[PDB]
Design a protein around this ligand. Structure first.
Ligand SMILES: [Cl-]
Ligand code: NA
Length: 129
């Protein structure tokens, strides 16, 4: 599923991401935009053999199991395919674990390079929340 901007913001808010670990809702929408272009089915393979899955491009080396990343940890205890569903519940629950891990949202390269320090509030403007 390809989410709309305000559609995703509302879905993320209902799942408790607004101000989760101090990150306002706009940070999460901005990260999803530049990680996956709001597409839950996005996948991207990395040079180390791992693959990033879903709307927040969660990596298979640490967080989910795709059966082809030797020595991965699967810290979210979920198949990576679950992160591609139109229901973003699995991706949000796993992202909550990632953002609490230590470096906050810097774990998302696209957020660090394209959202951090910008006017992220613009990503929820006009939305009925
Ligand atoms: Cl933080
Ligand atoms: Na894994």
């Amino acid at each position: 599923k390809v989410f709309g901007r305000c559609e995703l913001a509302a879905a993320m808010k209902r799942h408790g991401l607004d101000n989760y670990r101090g990150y306002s809702l706009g940070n999460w929408v901005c990260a999803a935009k530049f990680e996956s272009n709001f597409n839950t089915q996005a996948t991207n393979r990395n040079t180390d053999g791992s693959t990033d899955y879903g709307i927040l491009q969660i990596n298979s080396r640490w967080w989910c199991n795709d059966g082809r990343t030797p020595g991965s940890r699967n810290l979210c205890n979920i198949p990576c395919s679950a992160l591609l569903s139109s229901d973003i519940t699995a991706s949000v629950n796993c992202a909550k674990k990632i953002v609490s891990d230590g470096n906050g949202m810097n774990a998302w390269v696209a957020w660090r390079n394209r959202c951090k320090g910008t006017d992220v509030q613009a990503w929820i403007r006009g939305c009925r929340l």
